[PDB]
């Protein structure tokens with residue numbers, strides 16, 4: 001099953017740090033911040049091999065009973081199958097601020113202008129090993 | 135719904151710190167470490183008013199399809215309705231080590247000799263505000 005933190009509000013001014021390990025033969029895994037598996041304000045997918053996507057980050061939002069919105073992509077990809085990663089996320093009402101394992105950063109709009117989220121989860125071909133949400 | 139951290143293994147040598155706030159008119163709330171809502175290796179219930187229990191901690195394990203085992207109790211109760219609390223838990227194969235908001239400690243046996251747990255949750259009349267599991 002997926003790894004999740006539920007109903008511990010991730011609020012404006014708080015920081016989320018997750019650590020994990022990428023599966024050896026991973027296709028892709030995602031880190032998700034939102035309200036449900038069908039309501040995601042910040043989805044960050046890490047694509048080792050997905051169709052034609054290789055070594056790319058793909059970010060988007062998922063709206064309940066509606067679907068995926070406009071994707072954003074980054075070629076920053078400091079991730080290795082079989083290896084640990086760590087990611088830090090903070091946000092204000094306009095922006096999600098993501099910091100990757102190597103210190104590079106990606107930003108993604110806070111499309112709903114949410115000030116808090118009740119669900120953080122990892123899905124796909126990786127596992128989590130630690131979390132700080134505070 | 136309950137507040138939980140799921141499928142981020144809480145392993146030997148790691149520490150769990152949760153912060154939260156007790157509901158104003160709370161009867162009781164618990165912090166639980168185990169595998170499911172029916173499989174709990176360390177249940178720590180905080181009883182403000184429960185039957186004849188007032189201002190007491192009650193610790194126990196819950197076995198799946200079996201039920202609650204031998205309760206242990208403590209009168210250490212540095213908790214106030216409406217107020218923040220923080221708790222830190224670590225364990226080895228014999229013992230759960232719990233540290234309360236005021237620095238006092240309670241210990242509870244690791245009855246299964248588990249070296250890792252996939253579920254941490256809070257239930258009842260309180261809410262969580264932060265977590266460090268690392």
Ligand SMILES: OC[C@H]1O[C@@H](O[C@H]2[C@H](O)[C@@H](O)[C@@H](O)O[C@@H]2CO)[C@H](O)[C@@H](O)[C@H]1O
Nearest residue numbers: 030043045051058059060068069070071
């Ligand atoms: O946008 C995030 C989601 O992408 C979906 O895949 C897209 C893909 O990125 C796009 O290039 C085209 O292939 O449409 C696909 C289907 O919407 C993932 O399938 C999805 O899980 C999210 O990662």
Ligand SMILES: OC[C@H]1O[C@@H](O[C@H]2[C@H](O)[C@@H](O)[C@@H](O)O[C@@H]2CO)[C@H](O)[C@@H](O)[C@H]1O
Nearest residue numbers: 164177179185192193194202203204205
């Ligand atoms: O042992 C933890 C569980 O206690 C249950 O309550 C017990 C109670 O502590 C005991 O004094 C007697 O009243 O039996 C009750 C029922 O088993 C709680 O109901 C339960 O949720 C756990 O906290």
